[PDB]
Each structure stands twice: as structure tokens, then as C-alpha cells.
Short mmCIF file of N, CA and C and ligand atoms in Angstrom, two decimals:
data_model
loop_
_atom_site.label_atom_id
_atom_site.label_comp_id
_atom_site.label_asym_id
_atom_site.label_seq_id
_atom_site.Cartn_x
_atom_site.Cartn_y
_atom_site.Cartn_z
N UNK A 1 0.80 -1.21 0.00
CA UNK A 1 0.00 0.00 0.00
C UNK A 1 0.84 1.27 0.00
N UNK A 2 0.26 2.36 0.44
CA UNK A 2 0.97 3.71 0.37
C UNK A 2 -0.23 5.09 0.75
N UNK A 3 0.38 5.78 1.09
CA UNK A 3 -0.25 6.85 2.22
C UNK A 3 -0.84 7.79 0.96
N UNK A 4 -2.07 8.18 1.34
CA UNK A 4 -2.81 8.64 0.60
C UNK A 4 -2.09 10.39 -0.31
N UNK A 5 -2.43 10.23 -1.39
CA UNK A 5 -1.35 11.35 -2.51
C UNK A 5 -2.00 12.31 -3.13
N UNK A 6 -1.91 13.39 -3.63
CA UNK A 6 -2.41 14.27 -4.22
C UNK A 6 -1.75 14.89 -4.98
N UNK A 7 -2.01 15.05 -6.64
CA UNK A 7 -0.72 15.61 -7.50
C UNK A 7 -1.29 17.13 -7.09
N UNK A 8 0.28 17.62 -7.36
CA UNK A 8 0.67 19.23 -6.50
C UNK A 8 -0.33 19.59 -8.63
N UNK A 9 -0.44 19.27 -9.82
CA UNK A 9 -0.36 19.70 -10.58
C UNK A 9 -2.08 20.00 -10.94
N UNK A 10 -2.74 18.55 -10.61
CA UNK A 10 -4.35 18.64 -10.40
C UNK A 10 -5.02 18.87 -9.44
N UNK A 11 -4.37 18.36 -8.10
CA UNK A 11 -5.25 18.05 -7.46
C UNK A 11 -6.05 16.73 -7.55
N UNK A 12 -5.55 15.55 -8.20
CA UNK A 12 -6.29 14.38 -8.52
C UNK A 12 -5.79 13.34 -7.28
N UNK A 13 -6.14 12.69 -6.47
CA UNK A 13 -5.59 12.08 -5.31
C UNK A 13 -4.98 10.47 -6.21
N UNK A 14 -4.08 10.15 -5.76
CA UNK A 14 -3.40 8.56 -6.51
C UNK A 14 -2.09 8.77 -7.26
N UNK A 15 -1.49 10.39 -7.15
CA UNK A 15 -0.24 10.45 -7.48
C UNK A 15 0.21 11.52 -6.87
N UNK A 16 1.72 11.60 -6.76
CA UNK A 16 2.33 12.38 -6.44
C UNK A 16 3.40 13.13 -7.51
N UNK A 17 3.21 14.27 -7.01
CA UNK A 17 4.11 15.02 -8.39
C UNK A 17 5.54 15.09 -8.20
N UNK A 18 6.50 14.77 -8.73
CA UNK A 18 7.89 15.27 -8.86
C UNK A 18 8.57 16.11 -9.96
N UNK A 19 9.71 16.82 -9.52
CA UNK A 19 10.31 17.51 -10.42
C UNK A 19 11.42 16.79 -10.96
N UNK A 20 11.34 16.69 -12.50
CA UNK A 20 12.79 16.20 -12.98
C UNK A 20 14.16 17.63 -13.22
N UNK A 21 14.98 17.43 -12.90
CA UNK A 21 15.39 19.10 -12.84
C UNK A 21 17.05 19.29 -13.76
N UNK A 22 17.27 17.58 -14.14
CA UNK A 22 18.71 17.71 -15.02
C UNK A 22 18.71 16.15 -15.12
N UNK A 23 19.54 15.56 -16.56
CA UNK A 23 20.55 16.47 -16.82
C UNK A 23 19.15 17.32 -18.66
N UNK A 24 20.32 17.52 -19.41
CA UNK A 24 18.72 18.17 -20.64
C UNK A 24 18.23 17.19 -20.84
N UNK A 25 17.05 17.32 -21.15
CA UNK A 25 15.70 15.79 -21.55
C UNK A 25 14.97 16.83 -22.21
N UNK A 26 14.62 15.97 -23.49
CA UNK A 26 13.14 16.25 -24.35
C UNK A 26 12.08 16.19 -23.44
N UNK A 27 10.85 16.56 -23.56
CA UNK A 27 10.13 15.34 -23.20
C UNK A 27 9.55 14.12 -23.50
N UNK A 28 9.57 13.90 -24.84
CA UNK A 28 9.63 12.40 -25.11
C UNK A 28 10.69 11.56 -24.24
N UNK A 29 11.83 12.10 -24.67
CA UNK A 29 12.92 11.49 -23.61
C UNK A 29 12.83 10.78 -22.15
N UNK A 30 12.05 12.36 -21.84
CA UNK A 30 12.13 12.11 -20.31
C UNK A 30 11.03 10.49 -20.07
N UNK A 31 10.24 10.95 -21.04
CA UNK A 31 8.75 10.05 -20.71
C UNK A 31 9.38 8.47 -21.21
N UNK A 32 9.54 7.98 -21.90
CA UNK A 32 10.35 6.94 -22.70
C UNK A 32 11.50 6.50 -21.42
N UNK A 33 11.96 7.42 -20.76
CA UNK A 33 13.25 6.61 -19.69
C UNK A 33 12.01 6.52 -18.81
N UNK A 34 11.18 7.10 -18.23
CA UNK A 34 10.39 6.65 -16.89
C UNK A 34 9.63 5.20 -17.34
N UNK A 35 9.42 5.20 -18.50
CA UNK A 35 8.22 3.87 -18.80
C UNK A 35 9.01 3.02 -19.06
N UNK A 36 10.27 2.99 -19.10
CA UNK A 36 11.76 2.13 -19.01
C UNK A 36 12.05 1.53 -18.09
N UNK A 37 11.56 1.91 -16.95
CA UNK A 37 11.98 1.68 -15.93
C UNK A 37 10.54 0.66 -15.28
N UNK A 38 9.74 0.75 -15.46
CA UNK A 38 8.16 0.21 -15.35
C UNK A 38 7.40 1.19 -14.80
N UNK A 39 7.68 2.46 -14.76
CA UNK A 39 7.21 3.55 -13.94
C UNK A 39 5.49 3.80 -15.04
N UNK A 40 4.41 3.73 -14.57
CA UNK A 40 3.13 4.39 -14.84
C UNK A 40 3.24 5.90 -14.83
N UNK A 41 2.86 6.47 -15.86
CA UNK A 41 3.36 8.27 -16.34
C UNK A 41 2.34 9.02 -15.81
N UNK A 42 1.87 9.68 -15.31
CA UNK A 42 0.71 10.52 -14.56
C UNK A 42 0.39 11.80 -15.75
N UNK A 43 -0.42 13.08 -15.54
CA UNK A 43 0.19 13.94 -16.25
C UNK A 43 1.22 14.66 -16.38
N UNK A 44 2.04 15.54 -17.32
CA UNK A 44 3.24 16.16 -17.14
C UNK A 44 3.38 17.75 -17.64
N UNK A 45 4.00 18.29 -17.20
CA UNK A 45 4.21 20.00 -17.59
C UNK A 45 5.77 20.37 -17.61
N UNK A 46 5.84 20.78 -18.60
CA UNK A 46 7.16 21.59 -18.99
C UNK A 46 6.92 23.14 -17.82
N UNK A 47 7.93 23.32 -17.37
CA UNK A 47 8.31 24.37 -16.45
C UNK A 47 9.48 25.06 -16.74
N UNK A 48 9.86 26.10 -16.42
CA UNK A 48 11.45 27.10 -16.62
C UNK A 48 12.37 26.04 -16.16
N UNK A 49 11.87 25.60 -14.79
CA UNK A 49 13.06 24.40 -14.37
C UNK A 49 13.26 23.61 -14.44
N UNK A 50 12.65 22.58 -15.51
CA UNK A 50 12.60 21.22 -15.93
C UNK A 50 11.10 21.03 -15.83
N UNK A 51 10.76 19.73 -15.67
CA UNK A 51 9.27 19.18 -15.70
C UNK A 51 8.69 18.55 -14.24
N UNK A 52 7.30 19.01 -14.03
CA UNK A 52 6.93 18.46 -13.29
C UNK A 52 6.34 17.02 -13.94
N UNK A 53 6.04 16.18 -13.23
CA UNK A 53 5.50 14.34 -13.90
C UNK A 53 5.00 14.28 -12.28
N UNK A 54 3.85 13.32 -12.73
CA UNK A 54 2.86 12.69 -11.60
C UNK A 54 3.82 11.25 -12.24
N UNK A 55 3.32 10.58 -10.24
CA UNK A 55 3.90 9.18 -10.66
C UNK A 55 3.21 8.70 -9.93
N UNK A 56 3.03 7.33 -9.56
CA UNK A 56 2.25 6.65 -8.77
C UNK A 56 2.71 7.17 -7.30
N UNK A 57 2.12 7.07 -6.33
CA UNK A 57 2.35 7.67 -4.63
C UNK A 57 3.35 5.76 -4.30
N UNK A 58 2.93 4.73 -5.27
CA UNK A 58 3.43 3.73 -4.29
C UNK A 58 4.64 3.39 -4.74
N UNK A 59 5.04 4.60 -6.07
CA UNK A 59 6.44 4.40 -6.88
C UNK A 59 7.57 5.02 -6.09
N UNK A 60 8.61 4.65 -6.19
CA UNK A 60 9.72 4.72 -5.54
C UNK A 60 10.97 5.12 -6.72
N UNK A 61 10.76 6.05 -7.61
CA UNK A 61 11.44 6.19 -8.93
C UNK A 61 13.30 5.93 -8.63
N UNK A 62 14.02 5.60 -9.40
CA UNK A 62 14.84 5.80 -9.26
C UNK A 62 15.58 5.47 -10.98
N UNK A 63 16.13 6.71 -11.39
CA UNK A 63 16.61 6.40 -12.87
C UNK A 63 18.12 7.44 -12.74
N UNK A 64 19.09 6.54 -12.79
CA UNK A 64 20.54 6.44 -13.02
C UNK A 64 21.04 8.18 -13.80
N UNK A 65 21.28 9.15 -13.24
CA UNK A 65 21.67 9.74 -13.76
C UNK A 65 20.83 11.48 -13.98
N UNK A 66 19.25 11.21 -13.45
CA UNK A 66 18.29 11.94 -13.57
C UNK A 66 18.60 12.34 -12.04
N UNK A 67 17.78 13.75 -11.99
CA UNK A 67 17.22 13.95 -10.30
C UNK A 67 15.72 14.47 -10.82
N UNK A 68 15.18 13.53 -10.00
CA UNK A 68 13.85 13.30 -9.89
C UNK A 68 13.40 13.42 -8.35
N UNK A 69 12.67 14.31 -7.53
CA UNK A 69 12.71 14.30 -6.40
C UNK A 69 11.34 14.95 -6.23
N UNK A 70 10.59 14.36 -5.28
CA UNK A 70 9.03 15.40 -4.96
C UNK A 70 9.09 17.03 -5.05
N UNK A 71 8.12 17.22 -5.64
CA UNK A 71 7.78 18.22 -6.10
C UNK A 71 7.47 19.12 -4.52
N UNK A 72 8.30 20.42 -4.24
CA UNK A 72 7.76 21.32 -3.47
C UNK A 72 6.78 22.33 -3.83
N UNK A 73 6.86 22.98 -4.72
CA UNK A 73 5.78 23.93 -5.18
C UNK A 73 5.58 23.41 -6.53
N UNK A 74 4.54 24.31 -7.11
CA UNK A 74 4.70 24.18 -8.74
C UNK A 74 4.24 25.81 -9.01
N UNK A 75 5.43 25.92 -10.00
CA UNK A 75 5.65 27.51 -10.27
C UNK A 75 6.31 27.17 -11.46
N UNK A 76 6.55 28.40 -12.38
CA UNK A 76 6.81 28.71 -13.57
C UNK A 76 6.31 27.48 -14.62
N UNK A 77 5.29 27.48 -14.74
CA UNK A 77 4.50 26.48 -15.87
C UNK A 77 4.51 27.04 -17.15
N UNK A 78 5.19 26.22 -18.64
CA UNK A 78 5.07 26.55 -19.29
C UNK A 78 3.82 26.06 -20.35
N UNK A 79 3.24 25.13 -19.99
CA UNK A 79 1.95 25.07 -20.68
C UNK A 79 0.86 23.63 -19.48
N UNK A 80 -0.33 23.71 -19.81
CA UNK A 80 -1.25 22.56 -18.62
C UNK A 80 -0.43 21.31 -18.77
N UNK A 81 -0.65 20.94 -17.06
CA UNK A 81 -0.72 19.36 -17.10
C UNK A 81 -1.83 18.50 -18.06
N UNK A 82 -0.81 17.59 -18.96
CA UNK A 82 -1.60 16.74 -19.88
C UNK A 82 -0.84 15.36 -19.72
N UNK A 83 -1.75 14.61 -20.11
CA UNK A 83 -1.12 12.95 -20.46
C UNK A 83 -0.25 13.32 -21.58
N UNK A 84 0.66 12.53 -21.84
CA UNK A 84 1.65 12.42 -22.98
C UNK A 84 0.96 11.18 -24.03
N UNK A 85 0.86 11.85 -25.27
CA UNK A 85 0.32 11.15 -26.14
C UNK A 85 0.68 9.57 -26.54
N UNK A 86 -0.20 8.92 -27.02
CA UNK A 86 -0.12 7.48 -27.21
C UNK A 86 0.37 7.63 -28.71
N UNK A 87 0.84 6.67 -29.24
CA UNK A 87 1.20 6.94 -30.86
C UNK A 87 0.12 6.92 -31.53
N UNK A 88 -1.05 5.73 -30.86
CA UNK A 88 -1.85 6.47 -32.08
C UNK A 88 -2.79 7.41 -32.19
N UNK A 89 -1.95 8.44 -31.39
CA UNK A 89 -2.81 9.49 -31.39
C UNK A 89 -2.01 11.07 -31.23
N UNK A 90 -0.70 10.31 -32.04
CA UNK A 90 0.22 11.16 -32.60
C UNK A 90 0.52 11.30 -33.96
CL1 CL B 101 3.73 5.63 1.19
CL1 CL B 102 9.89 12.12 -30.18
CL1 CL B 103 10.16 21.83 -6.43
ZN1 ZN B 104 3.44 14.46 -0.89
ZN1 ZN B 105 -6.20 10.48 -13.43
ZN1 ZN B 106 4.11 20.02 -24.05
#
């Protein structure tokens, strides 16, 4: 189990938001190494300081080389939290 979550980005309870903050990542990139890892993708937002990403509250991320760490605020948004597209619907 895992202690009840709320993304800092919706407000939707069942994830928690983190910031990815280096090293440069697309965001395809970024999204493609998290689902690499078996990580479930929440919605995501490009920010001045990297990206915020929802992840599961019972995920425990850890990817070699990234800093990925809970999200304290969410500030400088450069466009809405959205799901990242499926291909076929790219
Ligand atoms: Cl927990
Ligand atoms: Cl791409
Ligand atoms: Cl933060
Ligand atoms: Zn929290
Ligand atoms: Zn949802
Ligand atoms: Zn975008």
C-alpha cells in the first residue's frame, strides 16, 4: 500500500508530483526513460526548471543519472498538465 497522494499539478488524489530538474531531456525522452523503468506516467508540464511528472504515490522512482525528487511547489509552468500522447494518437 501507500499513504494517501495528491498531485501538487491537479489536485487528482493517486499520485504524487515530482520535479525532474537535469541532466537536458526532451520530453519524449524524459517520458520513454520513466516507462523504461516500469514507472506508470501521470500527467506532465514543462516548467522554466525542468518538468513536473505525476507518478504513482506507491512508486519509488529511481533512474541512473536523472534527479527526480518530490515536487515542493509548482511555479513557472510553461503550458497545462496533460497525459503524454499514445502513438496512435500522434
Ligand atoms: Cl507511502
Ligand atoms: Cl519524439
Ligand atoms: Cl520543487
Ligand atoms: Zn506528498
Ligand atoms: Zn487520473
Ligand atoms: Zn508540451
Amino acid at each position: 500500500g501507500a499513504m494517501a497522494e495528491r498531485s501538487l499539478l491537479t489536485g487528482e488524489e493517486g499520485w504524487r508530483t515530482y520535479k525532474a530538474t537535469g541532466p537536458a531531456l526532451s520530453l519524449p525522452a524524459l517520458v520513454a526513460l520513466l516507462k523504461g523503468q516500469g514507472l506508470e506516467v501521470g500527467k506532465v508540464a514543462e516548467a522554466e526548471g525542468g518538468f513536473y511528472v505525476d507518478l504513482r504515490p506507491e512508486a519509488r522512482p529511481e533512474v541512473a543519472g536523472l534527479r527526480l525528487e518530490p515536487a515542493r511547489r509548482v511555479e513557472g509552468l510553461l503550458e497545462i498538465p496533460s497525459r503524454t500522447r499514445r502513438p496512435a494518437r500522434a
